[PDB]
Design a protein around this motif. Structure first.
Motif, PDB file in Angstrom:
ATOM      1  N   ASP A  15      -5.997   9.810   7.857  1.00  0.00           N
ATOM      2  CA  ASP A  15      -6.381   8.393   8.053  1.00  0.00           C
ATOM      3  C   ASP A  15      -5.934   7.778   9.396  1.00  0.00           C
ATOM      4  O   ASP A  15      -5.923   6.552   9.562  1.00  0.00           O
ATOM      5  CB  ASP A  15      -5.911   7.535   6.862  1.00  0.00           C
ATOM      6  CG  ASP A  15      -4.377   7.548   6.689  1.00  0.00           C
ATOM      7  OD1 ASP A  15      -3.662   7.996   7.653  1.00  0.00           O
ATOM      8  OD2 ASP A  15      -3.921   7.086   5.602  1.00  0.00           O
ATOM      9  N   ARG A  29      -5.553   3.617  12.784  1.00  0.00           N
ATOM     10  CA  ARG A  29      -5.353   3.752  11.352  1.00  0.00           C
ATOM     11  C   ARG A  29      -6.573   3.161  10.659  1.00  0.00           C
ATOM     12  O   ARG A  29      -6.984   2.023  10.909  1.00  0.00           O
ATOM     13  CB  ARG A  29      -4.053   3.041  10.936  1.00  0.00           C
ATOM     14  CG  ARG A  29      -3.799   3.003   9.435  1.00  0.00           C
ATOM     15  CD  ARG A  29      -3.528   4.395   8.891  1.00  0.00           C
ATOM     16  NE  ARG A  29      -2.865   4.380   7.576  1.00  0.00           N
ATOM     17  CZ  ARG A  29      -3.524   4.216   6.417  1.00  0.00           C
ATOM     18  NH1 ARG A  29      -4.848   4.014   6.405  1.00  0.00           N
ATOM     19  NH2 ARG A  29      -2.861   4.218   5.272  1.00  0.00           N
ATOM     20  N   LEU A  31      -8.910   1.342   8.153  1.00  0.00           N
ATOM     21  CA  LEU A  31      -8.733   0.212   7.241  1.00  0.00           C
ATOM     22  C   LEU A  31      -9.034   0.642   5.813  1.00  0.00           C
ATOM     23  O   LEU A  31      -9.911   1.473   5.622  1.00  0.00           O
ATOM     24  CB  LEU A  31      -9.667  -0.960   7.613  1.00  0.00           C
ATOM     25  CG  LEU A  31      -9.173  -1.846   8.773  1.00  0.00           C
ATOM     26  CD1 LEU A  31     -10.247  -2.809   9.294  1.00  0.00           C
ATOM     27  CD2 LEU A  31      -7.999  -2.617   8.250  1.00  0.00           C
ATOM     28  N   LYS A  72       1.735  -3.259  12.773  1.00  0.00           N
ATOM     29  CA  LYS A  72       3.083  -3.453  13.297  1.00  0.00           C
ATOM     30  C   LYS A  72       3.624  -2.261  14.105  1.00  0.00           C
ATOM     31  O   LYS A  72       4.607  -2.410  14.819  1.00  0.00           O
ATOM     32  CB  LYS A  72       4.047  -3.768  12.161  1.00  0.00           C
ATOM     33  CG  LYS A  72       4.134  -2.725  11.067  1.00  0.00           C
ATOM     34  CD  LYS A  72       4.919  -3.278   9.887  1.00  0.00           C
ATOM     35  CE  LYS A  72       4.917  -2.242   8.775  1.00  0.00           C
ATOM     36  NZ  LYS A  72       6.139  -2.309   7.929  1.00  0.00           N
ATOM     37  N   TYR A 101      -4.050  -0.778   0.712  1.00  0.00           N
ATOM     38  CA  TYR A 101      -3.697  -1.586   1.876  1.00  0.00           C
ATOM     39  C   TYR A 101      -4.745  -2.648   2.119  1.00  0.00           C
ATOM     40  O   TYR A 101      -5.187  -2.890   3.258  1.00  0.00           O
ATOM     41  CB  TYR A 101      -3.493  -0.710   3.109  1.00  0.00           C
ATOM     42  CG  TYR A 101      -2.242   0.102   2.939  1.00  0.00           C
ATOM     43  CD1 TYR A 101      -1.027  -0.533   2.886  1.00  0.00           C
ATOM     44  CD2 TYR A 101      -2.297   1.476   2.778  1.00  0.00           C
ATOM     45  CE1 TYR A 101       0.162   0.174   2.699  1.00  0.00           C
ATOM     46  CE2 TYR A 101      -1.106   2.205   2.571  1.00  0.00           C
ATOM     47  CZ  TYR A 101       0.082   1.551   2.550  1.00  0.00           C
ATOM     48  OH  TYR A 101       1.243   2.231   2.345  1.00  0.00           O
TER      49      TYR A 101
HETATM   50  C1  LIG Z   1      -3.802   0.396   6.572  1.00  0.00           C
HETATM   51  C2  LIG Z   1      -2.751  -0.535   7.043  1.00  0.00           C
HETATM   52  C3  LIG Z   1      -1.436  -0.132   7.078  1.00  0.00           C
HETATM   53  N1  LIG Z   1      -0.480  -0.984   7.495  1.00  0.00           N
HETATM   54  C4  LIG Z   1       0.955  -0.652   7.518  1.00  0.00           C
HETATM   55  C5  LIG Z   1       1.478  -1.009   6.097  1.00  0.00           C
HETATM   56  C6  LIG Z   1       2.455   0.127   5.801  1.00  0.00           C
HETATM   57  O1  LIG Z   1       3.812  -0.317   6.175  1.00  0.00           O
HETATM   58  P1  LIG Z   1       5.116   0.598   5.883  1.00  0.00           P
HETATM   59  O2  LIG Z   1       5.110   1.703   6.944  1.00  0.00           O
HETATM   60  O3  LIG Z   1       6.159  -0.452   6.081  1.00  0.00           O
HETATM   61  O4  LIG Z   1       5.056   1.347   4.572  1.00  0.00           O
HETATM   62  C7  LIG Z   1       1.974   1.291   6.642  1.00  0.00           C
HETATM   63  C8  LIG Z   1       1.157   2.358   5.883  1.00  0.00           C
HETATM   64  O5  LIG Z   1       0.535   3.177   6.856  1.00  0.00           O
HETATM   65  P2  LIG Z   1       0.522   4.756   6.587  1.00  0.00           P
HETATM   66  O6  LIG Z   1      -0.182   4.991   5.254  1.00  0.00           O
HETATM   67  O7  LIG Z   1      -0.146   5.412   7.785  1.00  0.00           O
HETATM   68  O8  LIG Z   1       1.983   5.107   6.607  1.00  0.00           O
HETATM   69  O9  LIG Z   1       1.152   0.778   7.638  1.00  0.00           O
HETATM   70  C9  LIG Z   1      -0.803  -2.274   7.851  1.00  0.00           C
HETATM   71  O10 LIG Z   1       0.142  -3.030   8.193  1.00  0.00           O
HETATM   72  N2  LIG Z   1      -2.065  -2.697   7.824  1.00  0.00           N
HETATM   73  C10 LIG Z   1      -3.056  -1.910   7.426  1.00  0.00           C
HETATM   74  O11 LIG Z   1      -4.214  -2.387   7.401  1.00  0.00           O
END
Ligand SMILES: Cc1cn([C@H]2C[C@H](OP(=O)(O)O)[C@@H](COP(=O)(O)O)O2)c(=O)[nH]c1=O
Ligand SMILES: [Ca+2]
Length: 129
Positions: A15, A29, A31, A72, A101
């Motif tokens: 992803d 990443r 959505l 972030k 997410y």
């Molecule tokens: C898909 C997505 C992930 N994320 C952040 C939330 C998750 O935070 P945490 O890392 O604090 O768990 C992390 C999951 O991504 P991954 O599944 O690549 O790790 O990425 C977002 O902030 N917005 C999004 O739209």
């Protein structure tokens, strides 16, 4: 929402993919989806699936939603298309990702993806098997 061009730099995993967008390298990443990590069950298959789809495409496009375009960790957040086909949706149809997410304001294609997930679950594909 509108599609914008990009070029594959490198596949990363189910992803996440490295693309050149407006002339700059960026990790994207996907959505509204979650693939397993490579070290988890169906992770290698997810990475392979995405890698094949992005590498074989003649045309990669990026589609941002209405909210934040960068998470972030500095990853761009988009729907990614491979010759007109949404990778995010294709993964879910195959049971290689779940819908996840789902944050308000970046959820335009949620119900499209849920519908694919319900069909993947019915078929008991991969993650649902
Ligand atoms: C898909 C997505 C992930 N994320 C952040 C939330 C998750 O935070 P945490 O890392 O604090 O768990 C992390 C999951 O991504 P991954 O599944 O690549 O790790 O990425 C977002 O902030 N917005 C999004 O739209
Ligand atoms: Ca993941």
């Amino acid at each position: 929402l509108h599609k914008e061009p990009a070029t594959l730099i490198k596949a990363i995993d189910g992803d996440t993919v490295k693309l050149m967008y407006k002339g700059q390298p960026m990790t994207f990443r996907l959505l509204l989806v979650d693939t397993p990590e490579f070290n988890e069950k169906y992770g290698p298959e997810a990475s392979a699936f995405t890698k094949k789809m992005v590498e074989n495409a003649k045309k990669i496009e990026v589609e941002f939603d209405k909210g934040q375009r960068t998470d972030k960790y500095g990853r761009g957040l988009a729907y990614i298309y491979a010759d007109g086909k949404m990778v995010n949706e294709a993964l879910v149809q195959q049971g290689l990702a779940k819908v996840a997410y789902v944050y308000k304001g970046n959820n335009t294609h949620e119900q499209l993806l849920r519908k694919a997930e319900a069909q993947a679950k019915k078929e008991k594909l991969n993650i649902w098997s």
